[PDB]
Amino acid sequence: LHKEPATLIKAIDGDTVKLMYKGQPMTFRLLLDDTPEFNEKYGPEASAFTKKMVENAKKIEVEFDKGQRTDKYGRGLAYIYADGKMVNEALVRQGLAKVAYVYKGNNTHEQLERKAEAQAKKEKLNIWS
Ligand SMILES: Cc1cn([C@H]2C[C@H](OP(=O)(O)O)[C@@H](COP(=O)(O)O)O2)c(=O)[nH]c1=O
Ligand SMILES: [Ca+2]
């Protein structure tokens, strides 16, 4: 897997973000993550977390996995990094996302996110409180 550049166009919610990728606007959906929706519990807090992460970042990178790069809605499927820090994994660490939607061609950082989820749970953070 390799990182590729991109630039924030706009925060959207906890687990989607609009980026410019190879010169083209594109809604990206975070592999391996499920944040609550805005109108659900911890939804505002998940949206806020992702937003600040991406808005403060000096460098946004996109990392595709081995399989499906676009979902059926035309959303890009990737790991996103904010100044070298994985947004997908960081949500899970803080108990603001669950590990979810783990399909076989696209699960490279599964064990890593599972490890973070276990530790969010131990601390009973946010969603696990
Ligand atoms: C994260 C992810 C979601 N999806 C699809 C499955 C879900 O389909 P359905 O919409 O048919 O339920 C939807 C969940 O996205 P949201 O959690 O953004 O709603 O996006 C993928 O196909 N691959 C993925 O890797
Ligand atoms: Ca969601």
PDB file of C-alpha atoms and ligand atoms in Angstrom:
ATOM      1  CA  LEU A   1       0.000   0.000   0.000  1.00  0.00           C
ATOM      2  CA  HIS A   2       1.187   3.552  -0.795  1.00  0.00           C
ATOM      3  CA  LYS A   3       0.176   7.060   0.198  1.00  0.00           C
ATOM      4  CA  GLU A   4      -0.900   9.522  -2.488  1.00  0.00           C
ATOM      5  CA  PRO A   5      -1.457  13.194  -2.092  1.00  0.00           C
ATOM      6  CA  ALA A   6      -4.791  14.991  -1.875  1.00  0.00           C
ATOM      7  CA  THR A   7      -6.269  18.256  -0.516  1.00  0.00           C
ATOM      8  CA  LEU A   8      -9.290  18.904   1.663  1.00  0.00           C
ATOM      9  CA  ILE A   9     -12.260  20.291  -0.186  1.00  0.00           C
ATOM     10  CA  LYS A  10     -14.642  19.893   2.801  1.00  0.00           C
ATOM     11  CA  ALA A  11     -15.340  18.050   6.048  1.00  0.00           C
ATOM     12  CA  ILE A  12     -18.635  16.119   5.765  1.00  0.00           C
ATOM     13  CA  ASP A  13     -19.183  13.829   8.778  1.00  0.00           C
ATOM     14  CA  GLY A  14     -17.377  11.367  10.977  1.00  0.00           C
ATOM     15  CA  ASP A  15     -16.434   8.855   8.207  1.00  0.00           C
ATOM     16  CA  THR A  16     -16.771  10.831   4.908  1.00  0.00           C
ATOM     17  CA  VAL A  17     -14.760  13.739   3.574  1.00  0.00           C
ATOM     18  CA  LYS A  18     -14.595  15.594   0.284  1.00  0.00           C
ATOM     19  CA  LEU A  19     -11.072  15.642  -1.198  1.00  0.00           C
ATOM     20  CA  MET A  20      -9.409  16.609  -4.429  1.00  0.00           C
ATOM     21  CA  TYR A  21      -7.667  13.511  -5.750  1.00  0.00           C
ATOM     22  CA  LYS A  22      -5.602  13.667  -8.933  1.00  0.00           C
ATOM     23  CA  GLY A  23      -7.242  16.939  -9.719  1.00  0.00           C
ATOM     24  CA  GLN A  24     -10.802  15.742  -9.282  1.00  0.00           C
ATOM     25  CA  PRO A  25     -13.403  16.308  -6.485  1.00  0.00           C
ATOM     26  CA  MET A  26     -14.426  13.089  -4.773  1.00  0.00           C
ATOM     27  CA  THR A  27     -16.229  11.976  -1.638  1.00  0.00           C
ATOM     28  CA  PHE A  28     -14.142   9.575   0.274  1.00  0.00           C
ATOM     29  CA  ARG A  29     -15.544   6.958   2.642  1.00  0.00           C
ATOM     30  CA  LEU A  30     -13.282   5.620   5.362  1.00  0.00           C
ATOM     31  CA  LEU A  31     -12.386   1.955   5.056  1.00  0.00           C
ATOM     32  CA  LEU A  32     -12.967  -0.207   8.141  1.00  0.00           C
ATOM     33  CA  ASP A  33     -14.936   2.478  10.052  1.00  0.00           C
ATOM     34  CA  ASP A  34     -18.522   3.188  11.049  1.00  0.00           C
ATOM     35  CA  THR A  35     -19.205   6.506  12.741  1.00  0.00           C
ATOM     36  CA  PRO A  36     -22.709   7.360  13.999  1.00  0.00           C
ATOM     37  CA  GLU A  37     -24.762   9.646  11.729  1.00  0.00           C
ATOM     38  CA  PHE A  38     -24.928  13.308  12.759  1.00  0.00           C
ATOM     39  CA  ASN A  39     -28.360  12.967  14.280  1.00  0.00           C
ATOM     40  CA  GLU A  40     -27.304   9.911  16.315  1.00  0.00           C
ATOM     41  CA  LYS A  41     -25.579   9.780  19.605  1.00  0.00           C
ATOM     42  CA  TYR A  42     -21.852  10.811  19.328  1.00  0.00           C
ATOM     43  CA  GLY A  43     -22.473  11.806  15.719  1.00  0.00           C
ATOM     44  CA  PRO A  44     -21.707  15.423  16.377  1.00  0.00           C
ATOM     45  CA  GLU A  45     -18.591  14.454  18.329  1.00  0.00           C
ATOM     46  CA  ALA A  46     -17.428  12.057  15.423  1.00  0.00           C
ATOM     47  CA  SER A  47     -18.022  14.803  12.808  1.00  0.00           C
ATOM     48  CA  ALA A  48     -16.180  17.307  14.920  1.00  0.00           C
ATOM     49  CA  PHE A  49     -13.236  14.989  15.498  1.00  0.00           C
ATOM     50  CA  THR A  50     -12.737  14.152  11.807  1.00  0.00           C
ATOM     51  CA  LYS A  51     -13.247  17.847  10.844  1.00  0.00           C
ATOM     52  CA  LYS A  52     -10.535  19.192  13.110  1.00  0.00           C
ATOM     53  CA  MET A  53      -8.214  16.408  12.160  1.00  0.00           C
ATOM     54  CA  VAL A  54      -8.464  17.146   8.461  1.00  0.00           C
ATOM     55  CA  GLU A  55      -8.875  20.951   8.705  1.00  0.00           C
ATOM     56  CA  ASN A  56      -5.754  21.383  10.902  1.00  0.00           C
ATOM     57  CA  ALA A  57      -3.653  19.112   8.721  1.00  0.00           C
ATOM     58  CA  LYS A  58      -0.947  20.528   6.614  1.00  0.00           C
ATOM     59  CA  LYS A  59      -0.824  17.388   4.463  1.00  0.00           C
ATOM     60  CA  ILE A  60      -3.651  14.991   3.594  1.00  0.00           C
ATOM     61  CA  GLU A  61      -2.790  11.635   2.026  1.00  0.00           C
ATOM     62  CA  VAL A  62      -4.986   8.914   0.569  1.00  0.00           C
ATOM     63  CA  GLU A  63      -4.028   5.232   0.730  1.00  0.00           C
ATOM     64  CA  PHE A  64      -6.076   2.738  -1.279  1.00  0.00           C
ATOM     65  CA  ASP A  65      -6.141  -0.964  -0.229  1.00  0.00           C
ATOM     66  CA  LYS A  66      -5.856  -4.017  -2.545  1.00  0.00           C
ATOM     67  CA  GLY A  67      -9.429  -4.305  -3.717  1.00  0.00           C
ATOM     68  CA  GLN A  68     -12.453  -2.151  -4.543  1.00  0.00           C
ATOM     69  CA  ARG A  69     -11.356   1.569  -4.782  1.00  0.00           C
ATOM     70  CA  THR A  70     -14.976   2.940  -5.350  1.00  0.00           C
ATOM     71  CA  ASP A  71     -18.214   1.824  -3.660  1.00  0.00           C
ATOM     72  CA  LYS A  72     -21.584   1.465  -5.332  1.00  0.00           C
ATOM     73  CA  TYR A  73     -22.350   5.145  -4.556  1.00  0.00           C
ATOM     74  CA  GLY A  74     -19.154   6.335  -6.356  1.00  0.00           C
ATOM     75  CA  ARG A  75     -17.441   7.101  -3.055  1.00  0.00           C
ATOM     76  CA  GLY A  76     -13.697   6.553  -2.965  1.00  0.00           C
ATOM     77  CA  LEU A  77     -12.682   3.869  -0.401  1.00  0.00           C
ATOM     78  CA  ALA A  78      -9.396   4.596   1.387  1.00  0.00           C
ATOM     79  CA  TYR A  79      -7.325   5.103   4.492  1.00  0.00           C
ATOM     80  CA  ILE A  80      -6.916   8.833   5.049  1.00  0.00           C
ATOM     81  CA  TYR A  81      -3.874  10.404   6.848  1.00  0.00           C
ATOM     82  CA  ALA A  82      -3.578  13.790   8.392  1.00  0.00           C
ATOM     83  CA  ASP A  83       0.021  14.851   8.809  1.00  0.00           C
ATOM     84  CA  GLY A  84       0.985  11.147   8.810  1.00  0.00           C
ATOM     85  CA  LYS A  85      -1.744  10.203  11.331  1.00  0.00           C
ATOM     86  CA  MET A  86      -4.448   7.776  10.229  1.00  0.00           C
ATOM     87  CA  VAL A  87      -7.916   9.281  10.647  1.00  0.00           C
ATOM     88  CA  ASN A  88      -9.566   5.829  10.300  1.00  0.00           C
ATOM     89  CA  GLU A  89      -7.590   4.327  13.147  1.00  0.00           C
ATOM     90  CA  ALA A  90      -7.820   7.492  15.344  1.00  0.00           C
ATOM     91  CA  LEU A  91     -11.610   7.615  15.426  1.00  0.00           C
ATOM     92  CA  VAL A  92     -11.637   3.966  16.559  1.00  0.00           C
ATOM     93  CA  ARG A  93      -9.037   4.682  19.264  1.00  0.00           C
ATOM     94  CA  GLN A  94     -11.192   7.463  20.782  1.00  0.00           C
ATOM     95  CA  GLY A  95     -14.358   5.368  20.702  1.00  0.00           C
ATOM     96  CA  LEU A  96     -15.942   7.578  18.022  1.00  0.00           C
ATOM     97  CA  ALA A  97     -16.151   4.805  15.403  1.00  0.00           C
ATOM     98  CA  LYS A  98     -16.661   1.040  15.406  1.00  0.00           C
ATOM     99  CA  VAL A  99     -14.575  -1.398  13.293  1.00  0.00           C
ATOM    100  CA  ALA A 100     -17.059  -2.215  10.437  1.00  0.00           C
ATOM    101  CA  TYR A 101     -17.564  -3.123   6.765  1.00  0.00           C
ATOM    102  CA  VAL A 102     -14.493  -5.313   6.675  1.00  0.00           C
ATOM    103  CA  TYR A 103     -14.520  -7.049   3.321  1.00  0.00           C
ATOM    104  CA  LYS A 104     -11.828  -9.412   2.119  1.00  0.00           C
ATOM    105  CA  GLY A 105      -9.914  -7.484  -0.567  1.00  0.00           C
ATOM    106  CA  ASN A 106      -9.786  -4.354   1.606  1.00  0.00           C
ATOM    107  CA  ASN A 107      -8.725  -5.295   5.153  1.00  0.00           C
ATOM    108  CA  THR A 108      -5.006  -4.533   5.331  1.00  0.00           C
ATOM    109  CA  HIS A 109      -5.213  -2.403   8.524  1.00  0.00           C
ATOM    110  CA  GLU A 110      -7.825  -4.599  10.189  1.00  0.00           C
ATOM    111  CA  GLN A 111      -5.763  -5.928  13.109  1.00  0.00           C
ATOM    112  CA  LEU A 112      -4.382  -2.491  13.831  1.00  0.00           C
ATOM    113  CA  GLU A 113      -7.915  -0.990  14.093  1.00  0.00           C
ATOM    114  CA  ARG A 114      -9.154  -3.919  16.120  1.00  0.00           C
ATOM    115  CA  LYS A 115      -6.313  -3.332  18.611  1.00  0.00           C
ATOM    116  CA  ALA A 116      -7.429   0.357  18.941  1.00  0.00           C
ATOM    117  CA  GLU A 117     -11.063  -0.627  19.409  1.00  0.00           C
ATOM    118  CA  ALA A 118     -10.141  -3.061  22.231  1.00  0.00           C
ATOM    119  CA  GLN A 119      -8.318  -0.191  23.944  1.00  0.00           C
ATOM    120  CA  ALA A 120     -11.186   2.299  23.445  1.00  0.00           C
ATOM    121  CA  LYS A 121     -13.385  -0.369  25.038  1.00  0.00           C
ATOM    122  CA  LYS A 122     -11.089  -0.975  28.049  1.00  0.00           C
ATOM    123  CA  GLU A 123     -11.240   2.781  28.756  1.00  0.00           C
ATOM    124  CA  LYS A 124     -14.985   2.771  28.042  1.00  0.00           C
ATOM    125  CA  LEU A 125     -14.593   5.863  25.813  1.00  0.00           C
ATOM    126  CA  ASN A 126     -17.517   7.698  24.208  1.00  0.00           C
ATOM    127  CA  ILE A 127     -19.459   4.966  22.328  1.00  0.00           C
ATOM    128  CA  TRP A 128     -18.310   2.334  24.931  1.00  0.00           C
ATOM    129  CA  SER A 129     -19.573   4.377  27.956  1.00  0.00           C
TER     130      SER A 129
HETATM  131  C1  LIG B   1     -17.083   1.355   4.251  1.00  0.00           C
HETATM  132  C2  LIG B   1     -17.717   0.690   3.065  1.00  0.00           C
HETATM  133  C3  LIG B   1     -19.067   0.904   2.831  1.00  0.00           C
HETATM  134  N1  LIG B   1     -19.684   0.373   1.766  1.00  0.00           N
HETATM  135  C4  LIG B   1     -21.120   0.553   1.502  1.00  0.00           C
HETATM  136  C5  LIG B   1     -21.886  -0.533   2.228  1.00  0.00           C
HETATM  137  C6  LIG B   1     -23.148   0.136   2.703  1.00  0.00           C
HETATM  138  O1  LIG B   1     -24.143  -0.203   1.724  1.00  0.00           O
HETATM  139  P1  LIG B   1     -25.662   0.225   1.915  1.00  0.00           P
HETATM  140  O2  LIG B   1     -25.714   1.720   1.703  1.00  0.00           O
HETATM  141  O3  LIG B   1     -26.261  -0.575   0.814  1.00  0.00           O
HETATM  142  O4  LIG B   1     -26.090  -0.122   3.301  1.00  0.00           O
HETATM  143  C7  LIG B   1     -22.780   1.622   2.765  1.00  0.00           C
HETATM  144  C8  LIG B   1     -22.490   2.119   4.176  1.00  0.00           C
HETATM  145  O5  LIG B   1     -22.053   3.473   4.147  1.00  0.00           O
HETATM  146  P2  LIG B   1     -22.472   4.510   5.300  1.00  0.00           P
HETATM  147  O6  LIG B   1     -22.053   3.904   6.613  1.00  0.00           O
HETATM  148  O7  LIG B   1     -21.683   5.744   4.877  1.00  0.00           O
HETATM  149  O8  LIG B   1     -23.945   4.578   5.173  1.00  0.00           O
HETATM  150  O9  LIG B   1     -21.628   1.788   1.957  1.00  0.00           O
HETATM  151  C9  LIG B   1     -18.946  -0.472   0.904  1.00  0.00           C
HETATM  152  O10 LIG B   1     -19.538  -0.998  -0.046  1.00  0.00           O
HETATM  153  N2  LIG B   1     -17.634  -0.727   1.095  1.00  0.00           N
HETATM  154  C10 LIG B   1     -16.970  -0.191   2.133  1.00  0.00           C
HETATM  155  O11 LIG B   1     -15.766  -0.473   2.295  1.00  0.00           O
HETATM  156 CA    CA B   2     -21.818   6.074   9.173  1.00  0.00          CA
END
